[PDB]
Amino acid sequence: GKLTNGALEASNVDLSKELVNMIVAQRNYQSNAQTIKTQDQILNTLVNL
Amino acid sequence: GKLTNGALEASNVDLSKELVNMIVAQRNYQSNAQTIKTQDQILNTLVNL
C-alpha cells in the first residue's frame, strides 16, 4: 500500500467490544471456578466417609 | 495582462459569503461535538455496567 506522510496509523482495538468480551470472559472464569469448587466438595465428602 | 499605474489590487474576499460559511461551519462543528458526546455517553453505559 501507499505511504501517507504527515500521519500515523492508530490502533484498531474497539473499547466496547473489549469490555463486552471482558464480561464474557469473567463469566466463563467464574463458571470454571464453580466447577473446581464442586469437585473439591465432592472429594471432601468422599473423604469424610 | 496589463498593468495599471496609480492603483492597487484589493482583496477578493466577500464578507457576506464568509459570514454564511462561518455559520455553516459552526453548525457542522456543533454536530460533530454532539457525535463526540454520544460516543462519550456510550462508553459510560459499558464502564458502569
Side-chain angles (χ1 to χ4, degrees), chain A residues 15-16 19-20 23, chain B residues 42-43 46-47 49:
Chain A
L15 272 164
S16 318
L19 293 181
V20 181
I23 285 180
Chain B
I42 297 331
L43 276 206
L46 277 321
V47 171
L49 292 185

Side-chain angles (χ1 to χ4, degrees), chain A residues 23-34:
Chain A
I23 285 180
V24 181
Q26 225 202 333
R27 285 322 159 171
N28 299 359
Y29 194 106
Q30 289 177 355
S31 176
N32 291 293
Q34 216 80 355

Side-chain angles (χ1 to χ4, degrees), chain B residues 15-25:
Chain B
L15 268 205
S16 318
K17 298 160 172 57
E18 292 314 303
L19 291 179
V20 181
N21 295 0
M22 181 159 345
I23 283 180
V24 180

Side-chain angles (χ1 to χ4, degrees), chain A residues 3-48:
Chain A
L3 281 68
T4 320
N5 189 25
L8 265 168
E9 189 184 340
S11 59
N12 58 60
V13 290
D14 277 318
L15 272 164
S16 318
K17 277 158 204 62
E18 292 318 302
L19 293 181
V20 181
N21 298 359
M22 218 169 37
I23 285 180
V24 181
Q26 225 202 333
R27 285 322 159 171
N28 299 359
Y29 194 106
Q30 289 177 355
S31 176
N32 291 293
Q34 216 80 355
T35 294
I36 281 183
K37 161 187 302 183
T38 285
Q39 302 285 131
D40 176 359
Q41 300 166 350
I42 292 171
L43 268 199
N44 163 284
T45 170
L46 252 172
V47 165
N48 285 302

